[PDB]
Amino acid sequence: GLMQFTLPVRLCKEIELFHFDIGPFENMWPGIFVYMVHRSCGTSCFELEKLCRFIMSVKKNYRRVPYHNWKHAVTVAHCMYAILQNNHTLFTDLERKGLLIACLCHDLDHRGFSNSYLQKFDHPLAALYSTSTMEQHHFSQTVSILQLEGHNIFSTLSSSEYEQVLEIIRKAIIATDLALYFGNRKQLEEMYQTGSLNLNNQSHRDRVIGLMMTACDLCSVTKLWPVTKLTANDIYAEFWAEGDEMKKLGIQPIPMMDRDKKDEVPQGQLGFYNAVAIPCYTTLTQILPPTEPLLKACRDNLSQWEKVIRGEE
Numbered sequence: 636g637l638m639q640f641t642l643p644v645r646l647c648k649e650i651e652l653f654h655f656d657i658g659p660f661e662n663m664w665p666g667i668f669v670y671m672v673h674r675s676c677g678t679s680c681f682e683l684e685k686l687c688r689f690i691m692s693v694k695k696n697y698r699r700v701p702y703h704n705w706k707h708a709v710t711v712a713h714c715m716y717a718i719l720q721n722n723h724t725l726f727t728d729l730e731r732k733g734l735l736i737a738c739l740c741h742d743l744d745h746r747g748f749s750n751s752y753l754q755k756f757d758h759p760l761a762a763l764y765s766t767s768t769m770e771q772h773h774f775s776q777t778v779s780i781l782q783l784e785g786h787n788i789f790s791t792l793s794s795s796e797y798e799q800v801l802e803i804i805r806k807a808i809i810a811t812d813l814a815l816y817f818g819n820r821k822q823l824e825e826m827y828q829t830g831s832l833n834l835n836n837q838s839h840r841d842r843v844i845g846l847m848m849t850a851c852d853l854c855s856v857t858k859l860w861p862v863t864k865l866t867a868n869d870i871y872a873e874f875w876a877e878g879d880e881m882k883k884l885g886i887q888p889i890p891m892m893d894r895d896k897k898d899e900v901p902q903g904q905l906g907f908y909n910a911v912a913i914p915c916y917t918t919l920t921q922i923l924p925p926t927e928p929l930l931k932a933c934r935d936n937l938s939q940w941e942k943v944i945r946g947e948e
């Protein structure tokens with residue numbers, strides 16, 4: 636109870652910034668996550684013995700895949716932390732508890748394949764969940780780990796609060812299905828511009844949290860250029876393995892997933908930044924002004940991809 640987690644000085648300072656990289660030392664990621672829950676939520680949000688056992692069961696249920704791994708989980712949660720610390724007063728105590736856990740859990744037991752490849756492979760998970768296939772699976776793995784004995788971090792919630800927190804996490808995890816992102820931002824855009832956006836409408840809050848989940852999930856595009864560039868190698872390593880697996884089923888994969896089209900990567904990032912990243916962080920800054928550094932960093936990395944195309948790197 637009087638046992639505060641601390642970090643070394645450089646991390647203690649850099650962790651509050653949006654562009655923080657959690658570093659290559661795996662064994663420090665749990666302490667980083669616990670640090671962020673204590674400062675974001677409070678030291679009294681979770682029984683510490685339960686939290687630690689939950690974190691390590693979550694870690695064990697991430698796979699050793701090049702991108703959708705334990706390190707992605709902690710990164711996406713760090714971004715959420717930054718958003719919540721920079722917009723302290725706009726969020727309920729249940730939202731702060733739910734959303735960091737949502738982020739740590741959002742890709743549980745990912746195999747490094749898209750929803751699309753699961754359906755063309757005819758994976759059993761595609762029979763059980765017709766849309767947002769992986770994302771329903773991820774929420775389902777979260778509930779599983781919450782029901783292991785000694786793992787219910789939400790033990791001290793009421794019957795009803797428990798149900799609200801599991802509902803926040805469910806919607807939050809579903810929202811990481813990028814197919815749902817496009818509609819969700821268009822609606823937030825129109826609601827903010829017409830002046831109808833209202834943060835007491837629970838269905839409006841839902842959309843906002845959905846946008847934050849996209850922002851945290853894409854936060855690779857808001858890092859120092861060498862972090863952004865090296866993360867892209869891991870992202871394409873999954874895409875090209877999925878591309879290979881499409882070819883094994885006798886299907887020409889889209890060029891994004893075709894390793895014979897490495898050459899077009901810089902233009903593919905340009906497309907992604909203009910179609911998804913910029914619009915995501917633009918709409919997010921409008922609704923939550925202190926998130927501006929995510930937009931400014933995204934615009935910087937776009938300019939870095941333009942430089943790659945021009946043969947200046």
Ligand SMILES: Cc1nc2ccccc2nc1OCc1nc(-c2ccccc2)cn1C
Nearest residue numbers: 853855856890891896899900903904906907
């Ligand atoms: C989906 C996607 N998700 C991301 C999540 C985080 C960070 C970067 C991301 N980039 C992405 O996509 C990148 C892309 N490459 C191509 C492409 C590449 C080579 C040849 C032809 C096309 C197209 N598109 C959209």
Ligand SMILES: [Mg+2]
Nearest residue numbers: 741742769811
């Ligand atoms: Mg996912």
Ligand SMILES: [Zn+2]
Nearest residue numbers: 707741742852
């Ligand atoms: Zn993710």
